[PDB]
């Protein structure tokens, strides 16, 4: 239920600046930064700051500072795929990295295999880092959670997080939570038929689930993914532990991945009974 992979480990960036800024282990920022510094990539598309608090905008990062400015999760839309072609046109990039949730990874891989309208982009993608995803929210839904239910505002939120059955918001001196089931019905309806939890088609996939706080569960998949991540570890940019030696460990990851797939198949079947078009 985890897709095809080469190795699964628990990992954390060794860079204290990245540790301070990261959602979890800082795998995305650390790995893109390493690839950039080594010349494996010349830039990366990331979810950078936007025009409202916690409302990111895709942007092409071409320095470690810009990668770092994009660190941390925003649980709303950042259509990262939209900037991939700009990145190889006026930005001049011929070796591109990006971070993508599973559905974005799908649009990208579909483009590479079938680039009907997409000229001279497919072979320029050198590192696709996938991050785990169970649902995403319209911005107004985040506002309902944060401004209405929890009684603060978007500007008071220093970090948001999802895990252990809860939606979490950290303020300057307070930790506020909602039961995650309370967010049901507020996510975009398109997520209902999504079968991919751990970004099965990415070069390397990473998320918090299966690892303790401040660490990440890292799944290497393709030759490029495994080799680039192993390189960074060898260069001492990540600390790693076998996933079997870590709590909660792989059992929880596999449980959630199987839950997501079962739910999706039920919803896909419901669509077909209604006669609605379904690509799955």
């Amino acid at each position: 239920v985890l897709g095809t992979y080469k190795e699964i480990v628990s990992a954390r960036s060794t860079d204290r600046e990245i540790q301070k800024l990261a959602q979890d282990g800082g795998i995305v920022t650390g790995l893109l930064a390493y690839a950039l510094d080594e010349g494996i990539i010349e830039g990366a598309v990331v979810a950078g700051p936007g025009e409202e608090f916690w409302k990111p905008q895709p942007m092409v990062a071409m320095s470690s500072d810009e990668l770092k400015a994009a660190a941390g999760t925003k649980y709303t839309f950042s259509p990262n795929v939209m900037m991939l072609k700009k990145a190889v046109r006026q930005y001049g990039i011929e070796k591109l990295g990006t971070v993508a949730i599973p559905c974005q990874t799908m649009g990208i891989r579909k483009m590479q295999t079938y680039p009907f309208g997409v000229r001279f982009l497919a072979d320029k993608i050198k590192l696709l880092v996938g991050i785990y995803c169970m649902e995403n929210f319209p911005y107004t839904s985040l506002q309902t959670f944060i401004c209405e239910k929890l009684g603060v505002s978007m500007e008071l939120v220093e970090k948001m997080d999802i895990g252990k059955g809860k939606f979490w918001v950290y303020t300057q001196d307070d930790v506020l939570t909602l039961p995650l089931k309370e967010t049901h019905g507020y996510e975009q309806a398109g997520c209902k038929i999504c079968k991919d939890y751990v970004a099965e088609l990415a070069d390397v996939s990473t998320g918090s689930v299966g690892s303790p706080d401040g660490w990440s569960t890292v799944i290497t998949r393709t030759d490029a993914g495994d080799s680039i991540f192993k390189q960074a570890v060898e260069a001492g940019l990540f600390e790693t532990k076998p996933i079997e030696e870590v709590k909660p460990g792989l059992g929880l990851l596999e449980k959630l991945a199987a839950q997501k797939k079962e739910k999706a198949e039920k919803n896909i079947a419901a669509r077909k009974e209604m006669g609605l078009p379904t690509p799955f």
């Binding site: 095809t4 709303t76 259509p79 795929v81 990208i108 579909k110 590479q112 079938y114 001279f120 078009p277």
Partner: protein, 231 residues
Amino acid sequence: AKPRIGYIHLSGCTGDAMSLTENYDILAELLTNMVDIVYGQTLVDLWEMPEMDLALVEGSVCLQDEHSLHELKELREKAKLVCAFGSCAATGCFTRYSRGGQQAQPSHESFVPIADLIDVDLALPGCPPSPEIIAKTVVALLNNDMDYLQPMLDLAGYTEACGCDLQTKVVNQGLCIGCGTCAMACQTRALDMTNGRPELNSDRCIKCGICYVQCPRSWWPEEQIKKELGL
């Protein structure tokens, strides 16, 4: 025995043929040793149409031009496979906006995708289709890779396209997940994203269909994608 290919230009702009030729490194080997371009006066000095294994038909067809209509009819008779080469042939593309009235043929008014008049076996939408999709398609036909070509066969039926297809076929259907693939693909930059949803600038839409073609939620070729990734 090399595949016998015709390149027939109707009311196109020749951008599709140009895209084919921007497979720079392989072009000499392609034309000389891999395939045999046997017809199409853009490339070949021949005025009697021969039998073809594949006709790459570029451009929409003008209902008021008798020769275009005859040429289209003849190539359907003489080619085993007809490919609508580029969105003008496949969907009408920007010629959907033509409405006649211009010198030196004020009656030349009506342009349609070629499937409106003949059976079409496969299609390559795009304005133009990328050098890569053209090369991959030819290689696939060379190697009888029918698993790879299935979406091209299917797309033969997609003959009326517009950026509004993202609403009518995806957003309206509960399928959109805000990835931005459509906006990445659009060759005219008619698309942006607003609050994670496609935003169409109709003034730039050429009705080529590429946004819906590339959308991961229109059709999902999972086995071919994984095959190429080694997953």
